[PDB]
Design a protein around this ligand. Structure first.
Ligand code: FNR
Ligand code: FNR
Lengths: 359, 359
């Protein structure tokens, strides 16, 4: 089966095409992860997936989405990942991490504690920053502080320092979080970037933040380790053909700048959208990005059944299939998939103490 | 549904009736557990089951089944359990442990490494002990050393110290392993026990080692925490009516001896047998032991589908349903079962960082 063929990219070889995408757990304290993350991630890696991408991890404290988000803005934070990365590799999966900055969507409650912007009288809240002082709206009404050129310079540096630490902690795959309406996405989008300087206005200008961050990170991230990014290529906002054409052009520019693979997603930059959720609904968009940008890709948001995952790969809509919620429901989803698709000795997708009994 | 009704025994309350029985992992080193076990067991506890019994943990080095078996025969071994017991409770599951001595079945290869007795010339092996110098046979041909009275007193004390240690590490539930052809089972069965002193021959003499071990453990095990045992009540060896009758009478004596719950199983004392494996096949036997000895019971060996487990509970064949291999396949099997049986808010069988996304 396609789903269980290995995948090599640079010096990294994943044992199958299943990737667990970054999924915030909101269980960290002041950016520090703890035994929640440790057991959660080592458990997922033992489950059989070829690649495990750690949740959005903030490059700087105001760049967390919530008070529960992970951070890697100091060496102490990075060191905390070391036992988890080792546990993931010992399980045979490839450890990756997504480094992030929530931009205007930051300073927010955990999704089960309101999901909304933290109240002004609430003591956990903080100032958010963004390309322009414009609120997302809806449940996220805080107006962000407008970034100056100096802020842009500092945040770029935090990304570089984050990538350096990720590298030293032993990650073998990095993902820049340029999606989901966070800082990078907000720089690209005209809905949120009304700047009149080198960073807003034209296409070149809106791409600039993202391209400069990619390039500053690329100087410190090893040439032989996959260097990837997540990016929301459309919004379902009524401007989809123009937005998609522009996003695919940015993807060609990421490729020109050494990006190795693109995780294709939705922008979620603004709330007034009409996203057509459904099984593998992202398949044709990812297929387009892949074919026109000529870059490997993955996507998510509906591929979490073994047959859908297998079809997307067979049709070359994706190179890796990212399966999120199914892995929360069942940490051994890879084994479930292998049994469904009639893989030989499917149970040895797991470690011997499980695989032996499940034959 | 009855599967998700809590269960109170002595001072302990289980959040539902799903128990994960002890399942050897063969991953320890000189009896010391490690990050295999910590992640395995914390992961299972977060899965939702009300009770998690740790695998057969040897009361002495020679009572390990294999070189990979967990031990609790020193304080250093018990210290190792401390952080994992707190991980299990933090997840809201009840930590239990099965303490054991493999008798003539010890000094064996891991199941994926031959599963037979360790060759004489292999230095990982050790001399085994049992009631009598008679081999199991088949894949376990080693003739064990016949135990002396000092051996019997020492092993009883090893069980007391193992209990004491288990208590002091914070376990809330203990299970004496008198099943599966290991030491305790092999004292009961006339197949394996040919002794002619106070410790074999009559019903009272074959029962003595098990009763005296229960009594000794009972002295150090707290009164307000459930004290239980697993016992093989028949062999499918052609002598079933007879064997089941004596076994239930022994269960009466355990009960008289302060046993709170009996894990009902098969003896596996000798290889020449005809076990009729099938879905819930132990159900009517567990029901009989429970009814006749007036002891709560659990059993296993085929209740691993949600309807079967629920049916056994409604029929009062069991008080708790143990689900073993299903949990190796899917550490979140409790959530799977809640969904299948239509529990309201079934996703909150899991902790918030999972439950939120899955409703
Ligand atoms: C609990 C949780 C955690 C988050 C996410 C999801 C969920 C459910 N997602 C989105 C995720 O990677 C994935 O794209 C979606 O879950 C859709 O894929 P599935 O349909 O679930 O397989 C996500 N994506 C991302 O880019 N960074 C992240 O940290 C987060 N956080
Ligand atoms: C890998 C593994 C590990 C072990 C076992 C099982 C398996 C598969 N079992 C037996 C187990 O507790 C249970 O009785 C059986 O798994 C049958 O129940 P299921 O049909 O699997 O739910 C077992 N039982 C026991 O009394 N002590 C133990 O340590 C073990 N070790």
């Amino acid at each position: 089966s396609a789903l269980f063929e290995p995948y090599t990219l640079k010096d990294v070889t994943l044992r199958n095409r299943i990737a667990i995408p970054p999924m915030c757990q909101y269980m960290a304290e002041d950016g520090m992860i703890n035994d929640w993350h440790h057991v959660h991630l080592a458990g997922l890696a033992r489950g059989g997936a070829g690649l495990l991408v750690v949740e959005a991890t903030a490059v700087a404290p105001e760049g967390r989405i919530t008070p529960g988000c992970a951070g890697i803005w100091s060496d102490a934070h990075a060191q905390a990942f070391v036992p988890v990365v080792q546990a993931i590799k010992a399980a045979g999966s490839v450890p990756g991490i997504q480094i992030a900055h929530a931009g205007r969507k930051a300073s927010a409650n955990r999704p089960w504690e309101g999901d909304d912007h933290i109240a002004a009288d609430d003591t956990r809240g903080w100032e958010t920053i963004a390309p322009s002082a414009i609120a997302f709206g809806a449940h996220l009404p805080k107006v962000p502080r407008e970034m100056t050129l100096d802020d842009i310079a500092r945040v770029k540096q935090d990304f570089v320092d984050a990538a350096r630490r990720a590298r030293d902690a032993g990650f073998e795959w990095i993902e820049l979080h340029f999606a989901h309406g966070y800082l990078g996405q907000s720089f690209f989008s005209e809905h949120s970037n009304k700047r009149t300087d080198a960073y807003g206005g034209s296409f070149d200008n809106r791409s600039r933040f993202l391209l400069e961050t990619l390039a500053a990170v690329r100087e410190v991230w090893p040439e032989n380790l996959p260097l990837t990014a997540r990016f929301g290529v459309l919004e379902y906002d009524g401007r989809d053909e123009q937005t998609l054409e522009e996003s695919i052009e940015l993807a060609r520019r990421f490729k020109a700048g050494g990006l190795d693979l693109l995780s294709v997603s939705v922008g979620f930059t603004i709330p007034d959208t009409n996203i057509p959720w459904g099984p593998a609904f992202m398949g044709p968009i990812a297929e387009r990005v892949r074919r026109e940008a000529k870059l490997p890709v993955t996507s998510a948001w509906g591929f979490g059944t073994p047959q859908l995952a297998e079809a997307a790969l067979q049709a070359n809509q994706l190179d890796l299939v990212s399966v999120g919620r199914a892995h929360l429901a069942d940490p051994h989803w890879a084994y479930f998939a292998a049994k469904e698709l009639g893989v030989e000795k499917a149970s040895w997708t797991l470690p011997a103490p499980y695989a032996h009994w499940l034959e």
